Fold this sequence. Notes:
Two copies of one chain form a homodimer. Chain A is mostly beta strands.
Amino acid sequence: ASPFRLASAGEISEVQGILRTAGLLGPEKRIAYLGVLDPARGAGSEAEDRRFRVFIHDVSGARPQEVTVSVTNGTVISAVELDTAATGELPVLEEEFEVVEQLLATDERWLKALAARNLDVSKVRVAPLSAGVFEYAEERGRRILRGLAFVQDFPEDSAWAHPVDGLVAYVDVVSKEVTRVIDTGVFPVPAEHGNYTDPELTGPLRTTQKPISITQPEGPSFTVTGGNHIEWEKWSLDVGFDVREGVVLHNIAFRDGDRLRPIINRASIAEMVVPYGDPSPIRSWQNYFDTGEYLVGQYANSLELGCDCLGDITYLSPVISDAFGNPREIRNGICMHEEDWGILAKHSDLWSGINYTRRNRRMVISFFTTIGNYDYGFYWYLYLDGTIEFEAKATGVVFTSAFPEGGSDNISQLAPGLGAPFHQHIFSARLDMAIDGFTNRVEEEDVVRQTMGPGNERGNAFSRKRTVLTRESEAVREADARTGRTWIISNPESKNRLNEPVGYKLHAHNQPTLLADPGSSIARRAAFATKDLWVTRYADDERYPTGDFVNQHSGGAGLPSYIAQDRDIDGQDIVVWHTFGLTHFPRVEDWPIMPVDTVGFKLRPEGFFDRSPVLDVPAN
Amino acid sequence: ASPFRLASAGEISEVQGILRTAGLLGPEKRIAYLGVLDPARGAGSEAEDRRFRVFIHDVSGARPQEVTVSVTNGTVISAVELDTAATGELPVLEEEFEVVEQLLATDERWLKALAARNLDVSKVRVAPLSAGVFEYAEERGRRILRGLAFVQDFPEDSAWAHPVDGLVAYVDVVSKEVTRVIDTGVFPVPAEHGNYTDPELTGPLRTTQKPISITQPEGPSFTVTGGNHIEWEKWSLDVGFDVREGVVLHNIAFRDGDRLRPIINRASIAEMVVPYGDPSPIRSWQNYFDTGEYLVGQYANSLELGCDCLGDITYLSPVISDAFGNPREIRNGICMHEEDWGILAKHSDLWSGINYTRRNRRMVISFFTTIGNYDYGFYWYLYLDGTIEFEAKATGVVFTSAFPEGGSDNISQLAPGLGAPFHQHIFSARLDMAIDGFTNRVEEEDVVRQTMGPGNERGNAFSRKRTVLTRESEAVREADARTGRTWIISNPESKNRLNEPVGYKLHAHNQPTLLADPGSSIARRAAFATKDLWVTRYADDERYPTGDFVNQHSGGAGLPSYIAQDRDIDGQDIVVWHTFGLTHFPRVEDWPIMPVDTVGFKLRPEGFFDRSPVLDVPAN
Lengths: 620, 620
Ligand SMILES: [Cl-]
Ligand SMILES: [Cl-]
Ligand SMILES: [Cl-]
Ligand SMILES: [Cl-]
Ligand SMILES: [Cu+2]
Ligand SMILES: [Cu+2]
Ligand code: NA
Ligand code: NA
Ligand code: NA
Ligand code: NA
């Protein structure tokens, strides 16, 4: 009965019926996005109204639509025809993944390019690549995908091992026209295979790994109620799933004594982009909003027990829409489990003779997704001591190219003739904060060094300073690792026993942000990425730092536009947008399949509690 | 038979005999440090010569001694009388921990101070605190400890809850004179207790934690041979233990195909200091070299199975000397085990239809120690993919003071009237590098942003640059998080299959370094701490970045002095000294006992291997 429950197959079918009956779902229509809408604010006393938000595509060439419907009242709440040159194109469809290769398969330019390289068209894979926005005037208002080719030698060959450099094509997937084919010249196609399951490459597999058994004889310490509501070691939350963002956390709160204390209203990865830094015209247009353009949630994997999730695992199976509004289940797409996490607290005292040791543990909510060559794990952790943490795990196969004779300042060689262009993976965590409720503010905290002198005669003193961010036009902050810069979210109206506003402190990894020249297309389209921290005033229609329609959108949209409203953020319903990412110069070790690398952030309680919240934890 | 084996009780007793027979170990003598010496370089074909290094104290007031002996040949190799005003005083003795409180127990100044506060002397604990070097001219050449007082209400009371502010005393532990007693005035002594085992404070303990069982039915995947030699998943190392540094790693190498490939010759935490930033005269002299002054290894705890080390655990029990050269065993002072570490690599390919997932794991070598209020865990991790990682875990009880009426810019309030002065914990990792052997160099690598223009028309290109550090006078580097700064250790004479020097890349957390004013005493005594990275030329007598005798030493010694030699580090036997630490502004959550916080660093292979070194890992 919780408004925050996961979408049911039944609900998805109702949406399809509603649209179909309203005439909005003819045979040429396609569902590119379907997601349930969160309950609105001002409903501290309201009745069930489940609404869903739909983006509908037309394959015949008609204008696409944005539509909101109520699945409790079977009504179209809103239906609007979009102008895509203006507000952007709809997310890429999985059904379009095969299209580029097929269109080029009958184009003479393409075939001429393939023949010159002596490549059999039936062996040539073409990645379905988001096109972004550059100089091609005929592209405005058209649904374009760009194509880069990789030879697959046999049905189970890793095509990534065999990039075709010096060649790219653009295609209009609607009109089914190949608009441009560009051959800058021939590069040898790297020859080695990258088949990480070939005994010829793996070699004799190891027999040295003895098993590690992790079990819970009394079951797990967390309970799940009403499908997705979690209670665990004082924590309370709802686990959501959206096809764009993937796993989303709702109503994170902590049970302190006899109060249920809210901390974060909604946590999600609201965007993730992969900009490439290779100035070759074959790739310099590459920037993949894996979240905004492709929708990470639709491609979450079914996690295999013992393989993908070890221990006592509890699965949720989130239901999504297909392109035709049928409900599809992602069997075991979400793992939920608790794991030991080493020592929590420990002291042996030289005076009391007391020896004290307590173990830590964390609740994990995770899922893993695939977007082309990439595979990402998205993990949320709740710790006994009140800490909240996110962690992304980056693996899969590196996006490949030729390695240029003479080397490169922008590409790494992984194997003979084989290159990997430099890129970043930059995430945006959207945190709808609710520290003891919605009245929150953000302060930027820096370490303050003090000069030796009067009142600091020995020159040992150091301090800190906090700066309240009061309006959106001054809540665009950058990192400063050198001065230990963090950001504190507090409630100015809720004090702890020492009469201090309760707060939580954000600790960022301080990784480099978007490296692109500010004048670049990507800088404008991914402006969120150019700064570590943004704070906005909450609003119903400000969901992604890149706006609702990322694909082939002009730029400026999203965060840069919202903060133009310059709204009061000093003791209000606010949202923190945290930029964090990996700058990836590929190594030989990354090839032929890459070991997990990680990035993330965490928040620790800062005067939230009146003392350590883990004194009541028993001693094993 | 390995030269790198742990010291045996038998060996310790021989050292004592040798010294005793040589006349160096009379009843007034004390052993303040005892440690075995590593085999020297140039012994690619030498015979067993076990030597030990001793620091001997005299309680009658005679000059202390440094002595080196051979336990295989029962000879004094060297014995030297130290001038402590010049080269520093010997490490604090555990037997001196009780001394300050006792000396003050009969001093009229002290008693007057206690009586004014109405504190029963028999309830007044006095921390035995390292004194450092300030303005007190009569202190040069004397063995001084400073005292700060904490009331213990009953045998099992946490005295930390009850600091006596506005009062400090200095004592000469040798002459047993109280040199100065300083009362800046009375502060109320905070009243609440901090007894984290009192049901009155803990409240009803939790019953919600279900058990988590971690077992290995076929035993562990690592073997231990000759006491301390570890082989695990291609890795080879020797696990050492020194009473100063604690757990030390020797001969880290990786078995690649049919070669044993060295990576690091010796890894240790060579120093750790805790500077306080409270300008009160009562504490402004506080800087505790937990490693250099107190010796962390002597206070390692015996780790309790199921409590301190979970899973299939293999213990080493390192033997140390007591103050009288008797061998004492630290039962189970070192845990060695392997743990699961989530996903190692994963890809589901849209073209081959292959789905691939492999699990990760790490070998842990750890120990946990107590120094007064502090308790630290020191963890070394070796990962399947070649990654080497260190992690310090900081817990225990915060060092306390009064909280000043009117607040403080340098102290946090944890409870009514109770303060916690701001401080840092700053570590120095000494890494005697051996990348494919001893011919190594270090490059500093930064991200390079490129300006939009000719040859970068779209403004998407970004690159990097590496700068070889050639001489010691230019190998003192600072962090630059903003430009993703890392440091690469490579062997210029050993290339990978792509003809690139094999390397390992150091990734630092980029935490703030020493915040003290450069003109401070601590800045000079802890100069290593003022910069993130130092590279030196290897030498036999350059062990600690702070020199051999930290206690009451003048300053300048250690790293700043070694790099003055300005030696060739470009393709030579080199050592990286990495500074890393926590800047700790204590929170309410830290009280009455603090949850673990962490800091560390890691190194990842960078073109070391010709491809991913984990293709041969089997698929669960
Ligand atoms: Cl998981
Ligand atoms: Cl990648
Ligand atoms: Cl451990
Ligand atoms: Cl502390
Ligand atoms: Cu990458
Ligand atoms: Cu601390
Ligand atoms: Na536009
Ligand atoms: Na909010
Ligand atoms: Na001196
Ligand atoms: Na070396």
